[PDB]
């Protein structure tokens, strides 16, 4: 019933403020199950993933108070019951918090490796074995209970690093996560937990040490800015802006992204709190290869692509994290972009005017790509399945209209 309508081809200008990180908050909320008292989060983004997580927490017995950018979560009433969600990668983080709190998790269920296998392997090493007792999966910790272990992650995994860390904070003994993911959201989750009384050291590095504690208390914690939202608006400002200030940005979390934009010839003025993106010219094509942080983020390759389509020359995008993250390509092609995918690889030639038409968001960051492309494109663009965008971009319509975009929510 809902679509986004954009009349593009018009320069944008002004300023936009970045909200708290989707990819921190979706771990922060379930981690709060571990606490003995209320935990309050500030700079909570108004995104659908947060609303869904709030609903689950309430159904599990938490009470949640919400206003402005704040969530007050009281997990004391949380019950040890099967989880009744699953469409969200973040649902996994309940495994770690429920294991940590109750010593067991009864949880909702392709033919090869699945990302979750990494989490379960870590849990198994901490004494929590799995089971398929009938339609559902059961994790249960053994003997004196959940315990520490030295865990080498066969491949780098943000989800498994975070889930292992959450599980470890109330485990018996020390957990050492080797080949840990370094994403700054992992630091944020560790920071929350430490201020709740955990003992986590090395977050942000390849080795994380956790010494299990008896109990966690409450705290009030500001979610780090969303570096992906920030990168999205920087890409947008470069593609169609004539001078836009992006506020609440931490450039230290965008080193790999900023490097590639500078390679293209993007001119921006970087401060400790904000970035001013100039009106751009003479951009040149680059090649993108995603990699674990601090490498170039897989979550940013799609939002960056329409800016690549502005540049002069040809390039390729290779996503080493999610090889088949290419579903924006078929949709961008409908807008007359010179873009294709074989594999695996995404090939583009920039410099062509895009033309608005009806396109469908296929996922969160592909949706963002179509929004930026819609703003660049001549004529009118209509985006359907906008629910994907609303998962991760807070106040997007309002933020963009404030930059002078002709964008509208229709139903």
Task: Let me know whether 168 and 50 are in one domain.
Answer: yes
Place of tokens 């949380």: 78
Q: Which of 180, 198, 223 is the last residue of a domain?
A: 223
Q: Is 226 annotated for ligand binding?
A: no
Q: Is 115 annotated as a binding residue?
A: yes
Whether residue 117 is annotated as binding a ligand: the answer is yes
DSSP secondary structure letter of residue 310:
T
236 and 214 within one domain = no
Rounded Cα gap, residues 8 and 6, in angstroms: 6
Number of domains making up the chain? 2
Which of these three, 166, 188, 223, is where a domain ends?
223
**Cβ proximity of 261 and 300 under 8 Å:** no
CA 386 distance to own-chain centroid: 17
Under a CB-based contact definition with an 8 Å cutoff, are residues 310 and 239 in contact? yes
Residues 207 and 295 in one domain: no
Whether 169 and 229 share a structural domain: no
Residue 194, annotated as binding a ligand = no
CA–CA separation, 398 and 22 (whole Å): 18
On whether 225 is known to bind a ligand per the annotation, the reply is: no
14 and 25 both lie in a single domain: no
Residue 399, Cα to own-chain centre: how many angstroms? 19
> Could you say which of 192, 223, 254 is where a domain stops?
223
- Determine the structural domain holding residue 307 and report its residue range: 1-18+225-411
- Residues 64, 25: one domain? yes
37 annotated as ligand-binding: no
Same-domain pairing of 1 and 73: no
Is 116 annotated among the ligand-binding residues? yes
Would the annotation count 23 as a binding residue?
yes
Beta bridge partners of 196: none
Helices (H), ranges, 84-226: 93-102, 115-125, 158-168, 184-195
347 marked as binding residue: no
What's CA 129's distance to the chain center, in Å? 29
The two tokens of residue 401 are: 């209209």
42 annotated to bind ligand: no
Are residues 206 and 291 both part of a single domain? Answer: no
CATH of the domain at 309: 3.65.10.10
352 and 373 together in one domain: yes
In 3D space, the residue among 109, 53, 101, 66 whose CA is nearest the CA of residue 80 turns out to be 101
Method: X-ray
Angle at 379 between CA 378 and CA 385, to 5 degrees: 105
Within this chain, do residues 255 and 375 fall inside the same structural domain, yes or no?
Answer: yes
Q: Which of 187, 265, 276, 196 is nearest to 223 (CA)?
A: 187
């Amino acid at each position: 019933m809902r679509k986004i309508v954009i009349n593009g081809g018009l320069p944008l200008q002004g300023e936009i403020t970045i909200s708290g990180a989707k990819n921190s908050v979706v771990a922060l909320i379930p981690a709060i199950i571990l606490a003995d008292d209320v935990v309050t989060l500030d700079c909570v983004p108004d995104i659908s993933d947060v609303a869904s997580l709030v609903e689950i927490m309430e159904l599990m017995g938490a009470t949640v108070k919400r206003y402005d950018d704040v969530l007050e979560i009281d997990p004391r009433g949380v019950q040890n019951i099967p989880m009744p969600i699953n469409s969200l990668r973040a649902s996994y983080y309940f495994y770690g918090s429920l294991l940590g709190r109750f010593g067991e998790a009864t949880v909702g269920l392709d033919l090869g490796p699945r990302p979750i296998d990494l989490h379960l392997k870590a849990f198994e090493a901490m004494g929590a074995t799995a089971s398929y007792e009938g339609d559902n999966m059961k994790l249960s910790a053994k003997d004196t209970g959940l315990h520490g272990a030295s865990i080498y992650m066969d491949t780098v995994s943000v989800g498994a690093t975070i889930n292992t860390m959450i599980a470890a904070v109330k485990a018996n003994g020390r957990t050492i996560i080797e080949n840990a993911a370094r994403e700054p959201e992992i630091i944020d989750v560790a920071t929350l937990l430490n201020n709740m009384g955990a003992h986590i050291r090395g977050a942000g590095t390849n080795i994380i040490i956790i010494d299990g504690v008896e109990r966690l208390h409450g705290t009030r914690h500001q979610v780090i800015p969303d570096r992906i939202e920030a990168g999205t608006y920087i890409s947008l400002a470069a593609a169609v802006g004539k001078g836009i200030r992006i506020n609440n940005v931490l450039y230290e979390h965008l080193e790999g992204f900023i490097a590639k934009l500078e390679e293209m010839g993007v001119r921006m003025t970087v401060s400790e709190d904000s970035i001013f993106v100039e009106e751009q010219s003479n951009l040149k094509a680059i090649n993108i290869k995603t990699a674990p942080y601090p490498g170039f983020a897989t979550d940013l390759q799609q939002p960056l692509t329409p800016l690549l389509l502005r540049a002069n020359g040809r390039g390729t995008i290779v996503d080493t994290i999610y090889e088949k993250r290419v579903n924006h390509v078929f949709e961008l092609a409908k807008m007359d972009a010179d873009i294709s995918t074989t594999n695996g690889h995404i090939l583009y030639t920039g410099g062509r005017d895009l033309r608005g038409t009806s396109v469908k968001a296929t996922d969160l960051r592909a949706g963002a790509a179509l929004v930026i492309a819609g703003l660049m494109a001549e004529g009118k663009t209509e985006i359907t399945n906008i629910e994907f965008i609303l998962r991760g971009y807070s106040d997007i319509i309002e933020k963009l209209r404030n930059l002078g975009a002709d964008i509208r929510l229709v139903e």
